[PDB]
Amino acid sequence: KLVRLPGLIDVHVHLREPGGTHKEDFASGTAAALAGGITMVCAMPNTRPPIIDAPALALAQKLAEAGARCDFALFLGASSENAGTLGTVAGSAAGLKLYLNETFSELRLDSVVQWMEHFETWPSHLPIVAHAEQQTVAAVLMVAQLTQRSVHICHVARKEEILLIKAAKARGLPVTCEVAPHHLFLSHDDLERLGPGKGEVRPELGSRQDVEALWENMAVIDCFASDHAPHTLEEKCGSRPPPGFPGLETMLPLLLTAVSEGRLSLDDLLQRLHHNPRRIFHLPPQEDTYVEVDLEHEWTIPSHMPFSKAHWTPFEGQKVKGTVRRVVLRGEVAYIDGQVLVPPGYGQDVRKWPQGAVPQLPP
Amino acid sequence: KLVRLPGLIDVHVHLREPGGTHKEDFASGTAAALAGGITMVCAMPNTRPPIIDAPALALAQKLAEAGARCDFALFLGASSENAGTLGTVAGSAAGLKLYLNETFSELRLDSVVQWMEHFETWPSHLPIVAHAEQQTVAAVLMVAQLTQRSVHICHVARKEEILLIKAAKARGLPVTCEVAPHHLFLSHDDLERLGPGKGEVRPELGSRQDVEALWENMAVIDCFASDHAPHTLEEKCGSRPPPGFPGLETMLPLLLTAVSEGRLSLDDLLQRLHHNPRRIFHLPPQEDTYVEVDLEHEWTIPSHMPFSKAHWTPFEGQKVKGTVRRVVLRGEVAYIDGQVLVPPGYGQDVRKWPQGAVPQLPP
Ligand SMILES: O=C(O)c1[nH]c(=O)[nH]c(=O)c1F
Ligand SMILES: O=C(O)c1[nH]c(=O)[nH]c(=O)c1F
Ligand SMILES: [Zn+2]
Ligand SMILES: [Zn+2]
Numbered sequence: 221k222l223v224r225l226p227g228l229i230d231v232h233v234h235l236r237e238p239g240g241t242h243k244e245d246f247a248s249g250t251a252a253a254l255a256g257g258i259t260m261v262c263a264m265p266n267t268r269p270p271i272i273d274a275p276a277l278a279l280a281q282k283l284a285e286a287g288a289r290c291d292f293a294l295f296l297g298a299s300s301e302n303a304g305t306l307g308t309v310a311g312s313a314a315g316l317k318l319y320l321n322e323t324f325s326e327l328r329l330d331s332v333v334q335w336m337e338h339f340e341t342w343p344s345h346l347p348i349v350a351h352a353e354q355q356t357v358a359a360v361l362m363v364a365q366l367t368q369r370s371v372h373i374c375h376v377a378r379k380e381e382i383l384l385i386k387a388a389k390a391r392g393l394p395v396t397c398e399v400a401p402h403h404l405f406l407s408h409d410d411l412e413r414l415g416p417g418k419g420e421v422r423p424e425l426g427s428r429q430d431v432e433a434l435w436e437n438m439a440v441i442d443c444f445a446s447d448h449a450p451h452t453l454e455e456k457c458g459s460r461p462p463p464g465f466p467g468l469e470t471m472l473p474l475l476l477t478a479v480s481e482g483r484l485s486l487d488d489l490l491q492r493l494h495h496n497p498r499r500i501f502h503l504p505p506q507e508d509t510y511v512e513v514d515l516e517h518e519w520t521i522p523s524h525m526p527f528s529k530a531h532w533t534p535f536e537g538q539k540v541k542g543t544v545r546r547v548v549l550r551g552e553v554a555y556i557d558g559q560v561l562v563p564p565g566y567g568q569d570v571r572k573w574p575q576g577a578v579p580q581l582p583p
Numbered sequence: 584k585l586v587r588l589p590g591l592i593d594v595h596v597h598l599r600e601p602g603g604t605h606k607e608d609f610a611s612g613t614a615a616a617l618a619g620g621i622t623m624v625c626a627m628p629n630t631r632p633p634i635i636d637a638p639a640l641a642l643a644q645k646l647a648e649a650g651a652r653c654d655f656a657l658f659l660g661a662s663s664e665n666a667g668t669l670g671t672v673a674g675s676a677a678g679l680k681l682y683l684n685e686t687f688s689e690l691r692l693d694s695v696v697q698w699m700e701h702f703e704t705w706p707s708h709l710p711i712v713a714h715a716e717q718q719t720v721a722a723v724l725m726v727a728q729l730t731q732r733s734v735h736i737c738h739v740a741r742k743e744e745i746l747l748i749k750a751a752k753a754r755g756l757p758v759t760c761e762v763a764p765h766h767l768f769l770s771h772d773d774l775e776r777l778g779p780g781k782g783e784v785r786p787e788l789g790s791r792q793d794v795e796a797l798w799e800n801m802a803v804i805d806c807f808a809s810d811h812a813p814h815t816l817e818e819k820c821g822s823r824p825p826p827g828f829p830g831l832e833t834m835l836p837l838l839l840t841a842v843s844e845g846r847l848s849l850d851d852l853l854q855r856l857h858h859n860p861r862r863i864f865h866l867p868p869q870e871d872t873y874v875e876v877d878l879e880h881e882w883t884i885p886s887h888m889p890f891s892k893a894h895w896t897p898f899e900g901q902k903v904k905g906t907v908r909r910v911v912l913r914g915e916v917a918y919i920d921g922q923v924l925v926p927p928g929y930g931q932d933v934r935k936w937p938q939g940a941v942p943q944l945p946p
């Protein structure tokens with residue numbers, strides 16, 4: 221028998237359009253999403269041009285409307301120059317993304333004062349998410365407290381980080397977080413197989429103790445999100461390997477395997493890939509939308525999944541139990557057993573739906 | 584006419600004994616202190632052995648009692664192994680020092696969870712100070728809030744850091760800080776003259792804008808403290824230059840010059856080199872103790888000051904106006920015009936004085 225799930229949401233993907241379309245584009249990346257049982261994605265702003273101003277957002281919105289096969293929201297990115305300039309378009313974005321560790325120059329913040337300025341100027345009712353590793357988690361939490369608002373921490377990867385967040389939650393601080401599949405299912409032990417190029421990712425793969433700590437502290441994890449970060453094999457295996465793994469097509473199969481093994485429950489999964497993404501990011505329901513999965517079928521992850529242009533995967537060789545069989549999106553069959561059946565452009569910007577605007581107090 | 588000042592206190596010095604006595608020892612370092620108008624010093628724990636346990640503290644206490652010419656308190660240092668082990672000796676120390684950025688392996692903390700453990704286990708009534716640069720300031724402030732206590736930030740060197748602290752103080756958070764003379768009187772502009780070896784210090788020399796920001800935000804600075812960090816010229820000019828400047832003998836002359844120029848008042852100076860050190864660290868008064876300075880005498884800083892074994896100074900060539908003429912410590916003439924007149928061992932551990940114990944609620 222098939223199990224019917226609601227439309228799953230991935231709040232952290234890199235779809236590379238504009239400007240990196242050999243790595244992925246809206247059409248290929250959203251095909252990958254649907255194949256992974258994901259019907260709504262939130263796309264990060266570190267494209268070329270990066271989504272750091274109104275014109276870049278407008279361009280990305282049209283590229284997404286024309287290419288996306290599933291529904292989406294687009295993040296804006298914080299820069300050293302745009303604090304206090306995004307007020308008119310802020311509500312149209314998934315949220316604001318801060319890159320607080322490594323990134324390219326356009327998104328680099330050189331001072332915590334710049335973080336403060338963003339927390340002070342970004343509308344208080346809208347989401348802020350951060351790439352914030354190790355001590356940077358504590359630092360951005362401090363900025364959030366000084367400015368008396370919430371923050372969501374992207375891809376938590378370490379015992380250190382999840383325990384800090386746990387302590388913050390115990391103090392009633394408004395912080396949420398997500399964890400990516402590679403930080404639950406891969407570790408340092410896998411670097412021998414992957415090699416130093418393929419294995420490059422930020423946050424880096426953790427120790428066995430890091431992975432164990434994330435599982436032990438599942439209660440502290442609000443969301444799963446792939447951090448789908450496609451690069452071609454040539455790039456990953458070259459002289460200056462970019463960090464990141466593709467992950468849309470493998471996330472749900474990996475997690476379903478863990479459900480099958482009793483490592484977490486189906487509800488635990490659905491809180492983290494549906495309900496909590498909805499509530500943290502104020503994402504609307506999708507009418508007539510559901511995913512049918514098969515929990516019995518055992519298979520081995522191949523050297524590349526069918527859809528991502530990355531055309532490789534760090535999970536090659538892992539045995540999984542769990543398969544996406546069918547996806548229906550807003551009343552149309554979007555995916556069946558390896559075939560995507562909705563065209564580029566079927567997808568819509570959920571922030572334009574009346575139910576997808578973030579509620580706020582009147583002026 | 585001479586101006587009579589109270590006995591000045593430097594809460595941040597490295598006296599290198601035990602184990603680095605070619606760089607400085609208690610006798611030479613405290614001679615330097617007296618020559619700089621300083622009658623009480625707090626010595627950092629990054630010696631060899633480092634002061635991270637009771638036996639090392641006991642050794643350092645005896646070396647200081649035998650060698651110090653001025654009065655002192657000794658810091659304990661946080662390590663990855665000693666949280667929850669220092670309770671019996673904590674009250675005998677100046678406070679607990681956390682090295683949160685670069686340091687040697689024995690004092691390295693690999694996780695913010697280790698910082699949390701120290702804040703939770705160190706007695707709540709006793710001082711904690713941190714080497715915490717840039718975002719690390721925000722991170723350690725977060726740990727302090729989670730554990731609902733105060734923290735003092737060592738050598739604030741950047742616009743970013745002083746503005747973060749300013750914002751924290753505006754929110755009523757219990758944080759204090761100190762600034763070292765090199766971050767007020769030297770900058771990037773001086774690296775050409777100093778060279779890359781001599782110029783090595785942590786925190787590094789800041790931009791002109793950093794220096795300007797510290798002066799503009801003098802109200803936010805609770806203490807001046809030298810971070811006297813002596814290394815020999817051979818070491819500074821060698822293949823792996825250690826970071827740090829000697830500074831006991833130049834701190835007061837530099838600051839008196841600024842007082843003379845109306846950059847801050849004499850009271851501003853005395854709050855920062857006497858009253859605030861006393862109150863933050865619960866340091867006792869010194870009976871019959873005072874410093875007489877001459878504010879008229881103009882001189883140029885030489886290539887080395889008379890007492891520090893570092894035998895060099897990054898302030899060489901700077902013109903100053905202000906000289907220490909005489910120091911009286913506990914009723915004895917300790918220094919006159921270049922001559923130290925109290926022997927090694929004259930100095931005492933102020934934490935052993937009845938008035939130098941930190942008051943606490945009964946068990
Ligand atoms: O865009 C990427 O490739 C990327 N890859 C990573 O591994 N971490 C990131 O923070 C990131 F932005
Ligand atoms: O002990 C030292 O030499 C030293 N020198 C520095 O410049 N910064 C430090 O944090 C330090 F511990
Ligand atoms: Zn990231
Ligand atoms: Zn990412």
Ligand SMILES: [Zn+2]
Nearest residue numbers: 714737738785
């Ligand atoms: Zn330091």
Ligand SMILES: [Zn+2]
Nearest residue numbers: 597627810812
């Ligand atoms: Zn120091």
